[PDB]
Amino acid sequence: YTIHSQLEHLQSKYIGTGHADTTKWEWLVNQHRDSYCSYMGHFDLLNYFAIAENESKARVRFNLMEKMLQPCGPPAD
Amino acid sequence: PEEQKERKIMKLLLKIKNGTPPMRKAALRQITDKAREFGAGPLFNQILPLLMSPTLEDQERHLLVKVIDRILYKLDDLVRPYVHKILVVIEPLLIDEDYYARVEGREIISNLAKAAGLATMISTMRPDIDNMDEYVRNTTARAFAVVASALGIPSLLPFLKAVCKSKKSWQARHTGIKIVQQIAILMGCAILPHLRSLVEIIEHGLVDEQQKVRTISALAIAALAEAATPYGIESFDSVLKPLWKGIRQHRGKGLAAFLKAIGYLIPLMDAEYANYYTREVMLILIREFQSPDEEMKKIVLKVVKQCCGTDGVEANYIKTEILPPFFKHFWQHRMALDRRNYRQLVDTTVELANKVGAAEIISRIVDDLKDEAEQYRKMVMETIEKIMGNLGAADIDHKLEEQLIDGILYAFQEQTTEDSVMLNGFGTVVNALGKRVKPYLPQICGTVLWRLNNKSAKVRQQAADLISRTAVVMKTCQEEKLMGHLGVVLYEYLGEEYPEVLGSILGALKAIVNVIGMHKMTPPIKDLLPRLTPILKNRHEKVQENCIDLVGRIADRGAEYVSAREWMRICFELLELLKAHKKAIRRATVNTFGYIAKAIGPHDVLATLLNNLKVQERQNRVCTTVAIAIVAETCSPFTVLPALMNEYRVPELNVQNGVLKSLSFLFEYIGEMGKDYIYAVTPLLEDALMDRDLVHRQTASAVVQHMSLGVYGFGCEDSLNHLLNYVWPNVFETSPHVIQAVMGALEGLRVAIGPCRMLQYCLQGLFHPARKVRDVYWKIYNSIYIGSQDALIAHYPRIYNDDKNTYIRYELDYIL
Amino acid sequence: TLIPGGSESLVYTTLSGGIGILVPFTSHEDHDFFQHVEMHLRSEHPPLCGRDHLSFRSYYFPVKNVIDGDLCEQFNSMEPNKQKNVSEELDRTPPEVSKKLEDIRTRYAF
Amino acid sequence: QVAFPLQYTPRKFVIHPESNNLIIIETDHNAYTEATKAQRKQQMAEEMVEAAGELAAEMAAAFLNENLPESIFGAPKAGNGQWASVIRVMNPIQGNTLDLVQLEQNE
Amino acid sequence: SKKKLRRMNRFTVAELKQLVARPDVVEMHDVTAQDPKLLVHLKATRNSVPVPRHWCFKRKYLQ
Amino acid sequence: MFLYNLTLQRATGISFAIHGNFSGTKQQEIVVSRGKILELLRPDPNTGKVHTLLTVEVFGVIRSLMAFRLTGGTKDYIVVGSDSGRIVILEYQPSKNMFEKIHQETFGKSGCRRIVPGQFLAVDPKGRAVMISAIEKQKLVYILNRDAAARLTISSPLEAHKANTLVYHVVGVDVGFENPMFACLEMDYEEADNDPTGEAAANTQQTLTFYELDLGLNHVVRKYSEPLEEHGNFLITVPGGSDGPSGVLICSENYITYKNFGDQPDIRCPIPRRRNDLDDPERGMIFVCSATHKTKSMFFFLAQTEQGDIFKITLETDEDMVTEIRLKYFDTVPVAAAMCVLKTGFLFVASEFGNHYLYQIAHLGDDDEEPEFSSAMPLEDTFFFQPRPLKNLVLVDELDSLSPILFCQIADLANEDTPQLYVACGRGPRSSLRVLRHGLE
Amino acid sequence: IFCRKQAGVAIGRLCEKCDGKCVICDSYVRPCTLVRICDECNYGSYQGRCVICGGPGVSDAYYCKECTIQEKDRDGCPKIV
Ligand SMILES: [Zn+2]
Ligand SMILES: [Zn+2]
Ligand SMILES: [Zn+2]
């Protein structure tokens, strides 16, 4: 259970993990944020979207980082 | 009165002094926020007498200076009226033979004058630079260094200009000059933003009448050079001349220090300057080559290294100019007798060798191989060894190399300490003589052998060592008589009983047998190895290491010369080296089991290993299981897998677990190679994953882990899928070892099978009705997520969107 | 197939200006050869940028039955010391390796 | 390489086995077709005429006469849901666009 | 109490099976999910792999 | 099956670039990054032809690339932040023509995660520290000191773990031998996920903030937040220290802003648009890429805009403050993944889709019958301008690229025997169908 | 119990009782990579100690090749404090 002190330290360590009660909302929103961080990181899906819509890389990443805030609806209750 | 009260509540420095770390947290936090409201008014009078209390300890000081610095950051203004008090009570600390008193006073005064006012400082400590006492001048000067740390030189530099241009007092000019050298000590690199401003400050006193100021300014040149080395290719001609003249028209510690400082000026200069400047300073150097002084020796020799080590000065210059007085006055016993001079004289003399060759330096230090202070000839071979080892033996001519080899022999006999000094000297010197050494191999060996005959152990051991050094070149002679000598004479000393010599003898024999192969060894290995077998019982780490090394060489190469029956007996003896207390022995034992499996076939050694698995006590069971893995790796695994698998049926625990652990190591050793025996082994693991016991499933899971990490990337994913079907049910488990080996199997299986398959296994129980099952699935999915969170982006399901959220990902189903 | 009489191939053309081919193997001798070539190359000549090669090529789902011609073809630009070490593990000469490297592009592509 | 331009993003294409002749379908998001391009240009010139002040100050001609090549000058194409297309019939061996079908507004 | 209110907050297995779009999945383990609409959408996703049998059982895995 | 994987033509498209004297000389080298590739080119000043010296594989993703010079050395190291949990330090050996790994620091797990650093990375303008940063919850800082032999060292890293915070950019602010410090953007999705109404979605403000070193006390202290008016993408650094003031140009939508902490009253300027354009009444405008020419004489920025238009920016400054801003229309070139503005009078315009260009600078972008714009010029209305063909820049070089290769077809569709490749490539108006063949023209 | 406050560049060491095993896997074999610890479990009287015994730092804690295959060696100072 000191293992648990370390393990909810691990929950505090890695944003996106889970535990047996985790809610569909936390799960899917964390995966959605991660999806955004990687669309930004990988230099080429950025071209994919930039080219799919008719936007430009500054436009693209600005949208993405705005969306990063409430990507999957408002919260659960 | 509120002021006395504020001090009253302020003495929760007791809360911080005594108490829990809880107490520390309460008080530390409250005051770190109250540092304004409480103020420094009461603090400082509570605070100074503890910081001056005679035995406040290292970390008490550390914590209280933590306090003073952060509360002074906090209260830039709310510490104001206590400045001269803090100042004069801490001042002697920067000028203080405790480097950390210097450091800590320096840091807190940095922060003090920093969040404080410069005015007060200047006001108080102007009239003390002119003072009469060198004591107070040094204290205030190193204070001023700390205050420049606290604030910054710029705000001060004109007042420095004043305290250094004073025509009232020389006391104050000396004071400003040592302030200069002091910052030059403290801030270090941080000076190049000025880099000449201080040089201007100092140009006034190297010509001065008071030797005190003159020579402390020389040392200021030294200190500025020191902090002012490497970077600083710009502005420097504007002061070159006072340095130049004071060098000679001066006398002192400052001059030697200045020679190191102008060593920084010899690297940073150009021909028409670095020819005139060097050529001029060399005659200074020749008069200083007899300087008794230690830091003199350091500075002048460092200087010389860079100075007579440039491309401005031709070999002729040094060889006729520096060398005679240099060799004359530093190649007296005194320098090798000295603890500093030994090594540093080395440094610069090796560099002058690098400069001008060996056929003069070697000649100048030949007969120092026959002096009195054994430390001396010890030094001279230390040098010569470094020298020829870096440079080569091509430069040394005939008579030179002779006197060298001979002084070498002497040093080594004369030896009276247990040191690698003379050993390494010898090794290097012949390592560089290369092929030059042919004609003295009778001499060299005859010496070593007569030593090998001595009564006292120590010299015997030494001669064994020296053989182990020169072993390889003993070859390059092609000394029939002589390498034959060393062969048979070491076969003699194989009877020693000082483990420290016996080990080295074994080393030297091994390093002979490496050059000269088996079938022309001087003792035929047909008599060597029979002599070696009774040594394997010597229960000592070094002799055991070297003996098993030598027997491993022989059994590898000689193989057929020894008989199968001999190898079998030696197997039976190895079986109980697996209990030595040292791990090097046990790893060597396993390796030789491998070699014996190569020489003789695998089957008998494997039979003798299973019977050992039947033993108890774990650390020799585990090392035989390593050995089984090794035999299987060398002689292909199909030879051993049937016997292992079949032995998995003897109904005992320690042995079923031995089989499982051995397959673990085998797939790790095989790695990709397991791509062959994965099929053979699956139906046995599925057999033991359908229950037989806790330990049965714990061990089959470990086997799955290692198979998966070995077969990563070779396509045997259908088999690991099949075994997932059987491992995954154990997911709900409780015993720590069992569930832990299960989780390990699933990380291995995650890389080997991919993260789709395992996310699908983990889908349905994320949101399931029980909390035991929710928790295990979130444990797994956490570990699947941490590693390989980025594949999953293409593996997540499709999760429909209800009313007030959006949950589908339309990004991914744009058509194109 | 690209060059005349060259055996069949898979051309793949990416979205960043990359074009390449995946080419079968005809003999476990070829197969095992490059298999070992790169199995050593990963160990003694890892990528520059911190990564592991096995894990980069098994980013999403693990690797299965593809050898990294672009790691293999790096033996050329390696250093003589390592060129030795590895080709000696193969106990072929750096000539043997490098020619067996070049020719496999020779019979498929250019 | 040798490169024969297009003006809308290329989506896909198919082959004509008879004449070696290449039918490309090209299409873009966030763009007006040729028609609406010119039409809202001249229409903005109209609403531009209406400053009611000297009537005299005439820029509309220069509007309809300028054509700044989007190939360097970026594409005067905007909106959000605004699509544009083309089918083109070209020769691979030389870049003649032997036919051009240029479609409707949002198709 | 809180447990009684959320137990009554829980629904009928027929409530579920009629609500849901894919009714094959529904079991009382789901009817006992603190989020049964999720739990059932998950269990009805493609390619996913259901919990082992034996979490209910009192006997351990292969005893 | 058993397959062997071969790449015939490397990836050509460019994503990142840096410019520096990567061979110690004052001939400048350019280090660009393809997808999983680090490629180094040196532009010859004589013809104006860029020779692609060194093209290397890295087997990873280059997420971040930034060169730096040590305080006074003559070399130009590279700091690469990629998708492993490591920061790596690189150098050129022209003697072996090879990139060399000086140091290597692990700090976490692999893959393009979300809370593990590596997406953003900045330095301090002098070369004293680097910061590595994620898009949530994590940033570290590394200190760099020459060793005695001046062979670089790197000590353990610092920390700035702050939960529930995005980052739209991080950049080093130019201080003069003070503690170095960094300007990040930020945001805080926290409340907007505590509010069941979606109110806090709106009404949340970027916070242009500064963290600061304390090399003496060896930690990073949060100095200066300031709630910004509106989210803007990034922050161009103002050449401080001795030259220039300090401060950041916040490139927000429609508005570019000077700002620095202390006494400065914050400076605005709306963006001048092209006139009579055909763009949607809604469409905003953002500054895409930038590049700064800071020289003996002075400094200036170029920033580019969606329709490809480049602008010039210099600082009209009094004693310690700047006073007002002048953005004056330079020219319009392809949309850029990066600009690398050389000395020797060129600039590298790294195209984003298609052939990427090398222009040479002809006129400083000053003193002609193009208008003047300003942060002091008040107005009720905007500015405009009317663009034109290349005035201040002259197209020296044109490097080909397939990025993007939107479709292909192998065939033998000339009478030749060997097959050609028909590559449908390029974006929008700059697209094309292009013929590849194995021959050389 | 673990320190786990993140890694660094300071090597760890082993007492002679603890000589030979990996830090977690508890192996005795095939060690591949060296161990690194945090500054906080690096300082002071804890300089050069046994991550396991607490005994004097003499031999170098290492990482069993399994632990490096599964990258359980990329978490930092695992000191049982
Ligand atoms: Zn381990
Ligand atoms: Zn620790
Ligand atoms: Zn221990």
Structure at a glance:
The structure is cut from a larger assembly and holds 1 copy of chain A (77 residues), 1 copy of chain B (816 residues), 3 copies of chain C, 1 copy of chain E (63 residues) and 1 copy of chain G (81 residues). Chain B is mainly α.
Your description of this structure?
In chain A, helix 3 packs across helix 4 (about 55-65). Chain A has one domain. Chain A is about 60% helix and about 0% strand. Chain A has about 80 residues and is an all-alpha fold. The relative contact order of chain A is 0.12. Chain B is mainly alpha-helical and about 800 residues long. Chain B has one domain (about 1-795). Chain G has one helix spanning about 65-70; strands spanning about 10, 30-35, 35, 60-65. In chain G, the strands form 2 sheets. Chain G has a two-stranded antiparallel sheet. Chain G has a two-stranded antiparallel sheet with strand order 2-4. The N and C termini of chain G lie close together (about 5 Å). Chains in contact: A-B, A-D, A-E, A-F, A-G, B-C, B-E, B-F, B-G, C-F, D-F, F-G. At the C-F interface, strand 1, strand 2, helix 2, strand 3 and helix 3 of C face strand 1, strand 8 and strand 9 of F. Strand 1 (about 1-5) of chain D pairs antiparallel with strand 34 (about 430-435) of chain F, so a sheet runs across the interface. Chain E: It is found in: Nucleus; Nucleus speckle. Chain E: This is Splicing factor 3B subunit 2. Chain A: Belongs to the SF3B5 family. Chain A: GO terms for molecular function: RNA binding; splicing factor binding.
- Helical segment count of chain A: 4
Main sheet of chain A, how many strands, which sense, barrel?
none
Range of strand content of chain B = under 5%
How far is the first residue's CA from the last residue's CA of chain B?
Answer: 83 Å
Structural class computed from helices and strand pairing of chain B? mainly alpha
| Largest binding interface between chains | C-F, 46 and 52 residues
* Number of spatially distinct domains of chain B: 1
The Cα radius of gyration of chain A reads 16 Å
Q: Give a count of the beta strands of chain B, DSSP E runs of length 2 or more.
A: 0
What would the principal axes of the Cα set say about the shape of chain A? Answer: elongated
Order of helices and strands of chain A: HHHH
Number of helices of chain B: 45
- Inertia-based shape of chain B: flat
Q: In which range does the helix fraction of chain A lie? A: 55-70%
Quick one: biggest sheet of chain B? none
Question: In terms of topology, how is this protein built?
Answer:
This is part of a larger assembly, with one copy of chain A (about 80 residues), one copy of chain B (about 800 residues), three copies of chain C, one copy of chain E (about 60 residues) and one copy of chain G (about 80 residues).
Chain A: H1 2-11, H2 24-41, H3 45-52, H4 57-67
Chain C: E1 10-13, E2 19-24, H1 28-44, H2 53-57, E3 66-68, H3 69-72, H4 80-89, H5 94-106
Antiparallel strand pairs in C: 1-2
Chain E: H1 2-9, H2 13-19, H3 28-31, H4 36-43
The complex binds zinc ion (ZN) (3 copies).
Question: What are the main properties of this structure?
Answer:
part of a larger assembly, 7 chains, A: 77 residues, mainly alpha, 0% strand, elongated, C: 110 residues, alpha+beta, two-stranded antiparallel sheet, 3 strands, binds zinc ion, splicing, PRP2, branching
